[PDB]
Amino acid sequence: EKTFKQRRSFEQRVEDVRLIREQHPTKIPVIIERYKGEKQLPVLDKTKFLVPDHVNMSELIKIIRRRLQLNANQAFFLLVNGHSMVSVSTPISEVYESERDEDGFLYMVYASQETFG
């Protein structure tokens, strides 16, 4: 029930990224959490993801859909910073440039619907 930010101080998160970027300069560190209102999707067993920087959002989606092993008809969306729908053909490197957090991580929430209210 604690989020990644609630479990790891700023200082620790800065450090995770500073280091993982030194060691994997073409990989994007991503935090992927289940939406606090979500009812349909299973929980991932990890939170911190390292994604090659040339993968499109569409490809990350298809990967996480296989990590969650989903029926083809199950809806699945990634909402960058909990709220933004970025184009599925955006390379994850460009999403990282535009939407990274102050700690160096790129944050996303997954949910089974697209529009609330």
What is the residue type of 104?
G
Give the tokens for residue 106.
């790129």
Q: Which residues pair with 110 in a beta bridge?
A: 34, 78
| Overall resolution, Å | 1.9
Experiment used for this model:
X-ray
Which H/E stretch holds residue 77? strand 77-80
42 closest CA partner among 79, 63, 75, 70: 70
Please count the other Cβ atoms lying within 10 Å of the Cβ belonging to residue 96: 19
Q: How many domains, the chain? A: 1
Residue type present at position 20: I
Instruction: Write the DSSP symbol of residue 88.
Output: T
Using CA atoms, how far residue 69 sits from 4, 51, 82, 109, in Å, is 23, 19, 22, 17
What CATH code is carried by the domain that includes residue 42?
3.10.20.90
Residues 100 and 75: their CA atoms lie apart, in Å, by 25
- Domain coverage including residue 15: 1-117
